[PDB]
């Protein structure tokens, strides 16, 4: 029942990130009609989602039906409501910017500046992973309201995490995002 | 006419459906005569507010009890609190309320609650394992 629904809502578009992350994956919301189990993808650049004449769309059907008992396997391709407010593709974009030749010193700074300019209470992109030498470091950026203990870390604030497969090693990002809502006017 | 309250402070679990009425004087304390009250060892703890009320009062009174569960000592004091409340609910004086509060409340809530939700790190709620 609810456990299987939570498992599918946490897994179905999250195993799509093994191939859909190149198109600008940003998570999904479950819209479960009793007629059919709708699945959505928020594509930053959904031209690749359109596919090489359907080559990309039609790879999301066999797994959905062979082992999950779903009717009408379909995923409409849309985009996220706000670009910088979604933290997952922001972390993916920062990792790609590191991997591609962008200023790895300045990529995290520009990403944090863009996210805080997009209407956030606070943000922090922190990069744990060996960027230059053979020893691990940290590149934390501190700006804006980011509470760490209580209700906001439970549900109010979210996380954007990615990976980075470099030749020295593999790292990621931890961009914290809080939606601009007042907690307590005390 | 008839008094039906099981609130007693709820020592762990109580389940004491009070039933106090007025009749000829034949008093049946939970399908058991008071002369040969079946618990016996725990009736000394339970007959305190009724003893304070007086033989003439409870002889005038008529009481029955409906029960569900609870531990034996939790029963033995929660039912006593329920009987005290049933005594005061029937048309009576506040002198009995003063006497009931005089000895050890028996109209209040048990301030020591059920348990304390023992945390991982030891056997008990506060106790822990032995560090060498």
């Amino acid at each position: 029942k609810f456990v299987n629904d939570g498992y599918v809502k946490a897994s179905m578009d999250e195993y799509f990130a093994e191939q859909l992350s190149r198109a600008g994956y940003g998570g999904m919301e479950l819209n479960r009609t009793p007629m059919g189990t709708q699945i959505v993808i928020y594509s930053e650049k959904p031209g690749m989602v359109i596919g090489k004449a359907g080559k990309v769309i039609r790879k999301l059907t066999r797994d959905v039906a062979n082992k999950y008992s779903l009717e009408n396997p379909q995923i409409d391709a849309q985009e996220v409501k706000r670009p910088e407010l979604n933290a997952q593709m922001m972390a993916s974009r920062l990792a790609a910017s590191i991997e591609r030749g962008w200023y790895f010193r300045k990529a995290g700074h520009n990403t944090l500046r863009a996210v805080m300019n997009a209407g956030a209470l606070g943000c922090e992109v922190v990069i744990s992973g060996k960027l230059t030498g053979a020893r691990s470091r940290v590149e934390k950026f501190v700006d804006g309201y980011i509470k760490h203990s209580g209700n906001p870390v439970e549900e109010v604030v979210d996380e954007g995490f990615a990976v980075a497969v470099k030749k020295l090693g593999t790292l990621g990002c931890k961009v914290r995002i809080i939606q601009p809502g007042v907690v307590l006017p005390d | 006419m008839v008094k039906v309250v099981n609130s007693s402070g709820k020592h762990k679990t109580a389940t004491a459906r009070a039933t106090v009425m007025k009749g000829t004087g034949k008093v049946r304390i939970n399908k058991i005569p008071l002369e040969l009250y079946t618990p016996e060892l725990a009736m000394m703890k339970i007959s305190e507010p009724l003893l304070i009320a007086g033989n003439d009062v409870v002889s005038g009174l008529d009481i029955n009890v409906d029960v569900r569960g609870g531990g034996i000592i939790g029963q033995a004091n929660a039912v006593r609190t329920a009987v005290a409340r049933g005594i005061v609910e029937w048309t009576n004086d506040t002198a009995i309320r003063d006497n009931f509060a005089a000895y050890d409340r028996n109209l209040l809530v048990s301030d020591s609650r059920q348990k304390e939700s023992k945390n991982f790190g030891g056997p008990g709620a506060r106790a822990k394992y032995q560090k060498s």
Partner: protein, 44 residues
């Protein structure tokens, strides 16, 4: 689904320390990671 450790948990290919409780079929680390995404929450 009847064996000692033949069945593996989801994602993590593993044959020991898997939570088969509640029909979850996840390892303890993996289930700990994804309980907050699957609707579970440490309410107490």
């Amino acid at each position: 689904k009847s064996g000692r450790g033949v069945n593996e948990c989801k994602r993590c290919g593993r044959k020991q320390g898997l939570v088969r409780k509640y029909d979850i079929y996840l390892c303890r680390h993996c289930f700990r990671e994804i309980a907050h995404e699957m609707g579970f929450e440490k309410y107490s």
